[model samples]
Target chain A: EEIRAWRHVFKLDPNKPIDDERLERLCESGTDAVIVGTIDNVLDLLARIRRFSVPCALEVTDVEALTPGFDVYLVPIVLNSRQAEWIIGRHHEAVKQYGDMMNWDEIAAEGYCILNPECKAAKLTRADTELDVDDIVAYARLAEHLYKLPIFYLEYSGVYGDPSVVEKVKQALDQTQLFYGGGITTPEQAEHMARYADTVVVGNAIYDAFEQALATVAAVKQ
Target chain B: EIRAWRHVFKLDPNKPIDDERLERLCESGTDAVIVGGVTIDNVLDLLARIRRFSVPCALEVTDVEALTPGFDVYLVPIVLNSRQAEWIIGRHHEAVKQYGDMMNWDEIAAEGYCILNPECKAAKLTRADTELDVDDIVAYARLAEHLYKLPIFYLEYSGVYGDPSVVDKVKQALDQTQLFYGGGITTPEQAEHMARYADTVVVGNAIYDAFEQALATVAAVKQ
Candidate 1:
């Protein structure tokens, strides 16, 4: 419920190097929350982020990256993926390995629709990216009504997406929160996406242009 | 120093609005009413009806034949992103050649327009280069304020709601030029969002689509 109340979240990749000054600024940037994507050296990065009062979540990409003390654990289920491993196969294995000590209360499912074919996430998951506005809305409906997921994330990782598609998908959902993240390199783009999505996630922009990414917090909350 | 309007309701002369609906719209406490459209068929009829109320009316002059008198203000759009030169100066020069003798220079205001929505009618009619990014739009805003020195810089999305961040960046670029924003504003929340940056928030299609919600925009902006 607390995660659903967020309007903006800054996504930080643990593998990507960010200076201490920039990391501190991002934590204190008035954002509603921060999501960490761990590739390696995760504990050190988590310690740096835990120093701030901002809410933090960990994207459970690998079982090894899992840690305690974080506010939430987001389990992404790529709805449009061609591979079953991305949708459910890997999830089954993760559950089998750590089913006993899992904190079910801290876990939340993310129904992801990777739209950008050129992005790393889409390439790895083999997501079918050739979808129109209607197709995207149908997928969103599937996530909301069929799967009954908590969050429906429209992941356009490297480039900005059609705002009309975001608006159309949002109008088709009820109770399921919509999250949009992509090439939000400017505050204008952030504010534009915030109008349609429940929460606007700033990912690539933080590493590329730190100031503009920081400005998005005020833009969305405004 | 000028018309510090926060919210303006745009009424299309080509569209139909009943007497009671028109009454509520004019009395909705909106800052002003702008009468114009892609086609100015019954501008005179619309103008006369709007004049009965005390609210100010502005005519977005598109056709010289329909340039009827008695409007509170006249807005001439100079499409900054037009592909052709006619929209930039040809129309204005031609209009001045004929009506320069008896023109109300004081009431006439030049609007530097940058149509961002490609699907909108105004963009198609003017052949505007609507495929622009943030930096491109910021450059146009700079041109509107620093180079052209126009009184109003309008970011017209026409039928769609635009990026409010663009409006914020544009507002920051302008020193004295008043920013006018119009596109998709159906509810009071959308109106309030754009009102944060735009000097004048013009609600157009919402008046016909959702009448009551459109009426509530006046109170939304004023508060």
Candidate 2:
């Protein structure tokens, strides 16, 4: 259950029921919680998923239009973005506009995102390279102590990460929680990451094979 | 003639630099200075004080309000190979959106900076992953000059230097836009190697670490 992740695409097909067969397949992947959403589908998708035991964590870009549906808003600020906005600029806008609108109790995870170049989603962020062991430790410390960011996300999207990278961050952490995502395809990969990462997030690799995704979830919990 | 500028990034940004020390580096042929730091606290006052030394200054900034206009040039850098949307163009868009459109364009050199060196905080902060090949560097130069139409392309090693051929590759890809290079220049030989290709060579740590050593490094690039 500490594997703590299932990823579902929220491409709104209004005619399709909320509990569509595709979502069932994702739910059957045996994750403790489901992380899903798109910019347009946030409200409607959250409304449908609120009843489920596997709480939904929303992936938000338009942080201003926040509503009372999802359990948590995974607000990412890529740590190593060359552009200021990816790391802190969008955050400034979001905070200024919607600070008063937010639920005080709502968990807003400040994801310190690191993108691996091999992944396509990696290009969508300004992650420059594979973080070295020392740098990984340094980032975790900064996140926990200096930045006081709660979530340290190693987001590869499709690229399988080195376990040492996860281990290094874990050893350096203070109060920060850690989340790892990217190219985890097999149960073995999930298990390996589960040892070091607080939460192992699977998305692209799982969608490739439904059965494999289910099997991965079972192994991840082990 | 090619240009050589020295960059000084103090470990503690809030602590003011010795004015006489800055003046000495100025006398050693540093055409400009880039004060690099992440801490925005009290920087406006710091830069205004640094300006008193009469050195043409360029400061690294993350906040839009830091655009204090008195500095000779303001380097608005976007690491080209960084994987985040914000690092490429987002914050710049934020700045323009928040502040009115009228910028002193001449004072702004929108640097399409590529961070390949491991020692740099830029690489660590951005997780800048690429070890740029000739074609890749050329591609970025073309994108900077043609598509984005930004005025400057900088190869920042963040106080470490790699092969000079990387600079040569960038030179081959250029016609008009200025090319700037920095990081890991200590000796005159290293300065000459970087100077042969880059229109401007930015030397940072080598000068700050030792004043006597900086004199030779500056002479070599201007040589």
What lDDT does candidate 1 reach at residue B83?
A: 68
Which runs in model 1 stand beyond 4 Å of their true positions?
A: A1-222, B38-41
Worst 10 residues of 1 chain B by lDDT: B140-149
Candidate 1 docking class: incorrect
Instruction: Please name the candidate that would achieve the greatest TM-score relative to the true structure.
Output: 1
Candidate 2 TM-score, true structure as reference: 0.47
lDDT of 2 by residue, B65-173 (tens): 6655556666778777776665654555456434423445445667778788866777877766566566666666754553344567888876667778888978876
State the C-alpha lDDT per candidate.
Answer: 0.81, 0.62
DockQ of each: 0.01, 0.03
Residue-wise lDDT of candidate 1 within A88-124, one digit each (tens)? 5466455545554666667888888999998888999
Instruction: Point out where model 2 deviates above 4 Å.
Output: A1-222, B1-16, B38-42, B63-66
Q: Global lDDT for candidate 1?
A: 0.81
